[PDB]
Symmetry: D2
Subunit: 144 residues, 4 copies
């Protein structure tokens, strides 16, 4: 089933100048970027986005890092995109991340782990609707 | 000095699945993407954007190609960005584009040449304002 | 129950210069505008928006009118907002519209009837998501 | 002649439920709303917007008030719009605002005065570009 999932290139990814390399990782794996927008999140936006985790000890630090610089918001489309996205990102902890994943190659630490990806189809629908209107998502054919 | 210019990845660039390769081409040469937005242009948006070419013979075709699918709009910031961007893109005609340029590597024809770049600083300011609010452009420091 | 519904001031409403009067009709009735954006719809956008009616004879004319000029997109919030919105708009046919409604006071004809409103809660969710990201909708208190 | 200026309905205007009354005030005087967007400004957006007032004593407060809730951003188009808009708004201090002006009717205090209007054409161009892409501004004819 063709699904859509949210991907966010965190502040450290832009600072390292690897936006293109990250997008290429998805493209080469068949995850088609159908929505992309560079944006600098406000505290209200980050908090609203991570609301279900407001009780976790990491919450506050997470929010501050996510608003410390601009991020690149994206919607990836493909067969089993939600899971495929998580595979390509790799384990949350870079030291524990598999070979060839984004976090293994680009992440700094568990706290500065370069990318975000929806954890489930259920959440993907919410995360996407949070950052994009349906009119901002555009599929296109892959050819040549 | 540091300038900001508009770059657009045309419909064919997305279809070829080389959005990342193109962006990397800029990043690796010091042209920082400070604004990015995937969008599908309407005919009125394309016509307004290429207004300066309204009298040119290729206009109608350019407009049709530019609205045939979505594009990636970008604002690149860097030293001598307007010229630098154009150099990296390569000659309009892929047939005569230099080695290592975006067009030589990805363009298929003159009419479907993968990228657009503002031709001058003055036009850059106009092209940028056409697609981006100042609040949509964000500079950030590199490592 | 506090609900959110989509309202669109059609091209004829802007041409008559009654944007403010229309918004006032909602405000005075407790329907709070929590999202507003003036936009000129493309044919693709209008068609996608009215897709479920693509088989109806009115479809094509509807789409052309809806793209003939800019419109004002809005999300109204309030108790039973979906139904309240429909009450305030009035019958689709202005000649059949009740006293004090938007269509009775401002509409030209059944074809140029000034406003659009979600028909149900189910559709409101879809119409809103089509034109607005959740981050573009902002509730605020009514005071003074 | 015809000009375009920026108008912002401050947080208190929305809280009072007079968005429509304010808009009607402009429409009825020939100032056509050609761009409208409800938005909640972040501190960085408010600070950047009021940069020219960074040294003024009211700056900090202005910024806090402007981000306390959402605002309605608008671009008004019409004959002598920059001055016309300012006239309709009325004096900054509601206490001395003229009869029939927006501030006399709706403003509660100098610091919560319901509306903002570009003070000059040059600043109008900058304020407009700060919040709107040219593609977000749409003129239309009246009846």
């Amino acid at each position: 089933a063709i699904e859509r999932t949210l991907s966010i290139i965190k502040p450290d990814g832009l600072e390292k100048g690897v936006i293109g390399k990250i997008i290429s990782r998805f493209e080469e794996k068949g995850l088609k970027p159908v929505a992309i927008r560079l944006q600098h999140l406000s505290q209200a936006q980050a908090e609203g986005f991570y609301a279900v985790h407001k009780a976790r000890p990491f919450f506050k630090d997470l929010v501050q890092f996510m608003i410390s610089g601009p991020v690149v918001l994206m919607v990836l489309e493909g067969e089993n995109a939600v899971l495929a996205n998580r595979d390509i990102m790799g384990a949350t902890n870079p030291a524990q991340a598999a070979e060839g994943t984004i976090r293994k190659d680009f992440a700094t630490s568990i706290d500065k782990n370069t990318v975000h990806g929806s954890d489930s189809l259920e959440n993907a629908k919410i995360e996407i609707a949070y950052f994009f209107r349906e009119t901002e998502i555009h599929s296109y054919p892959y050819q040549k």
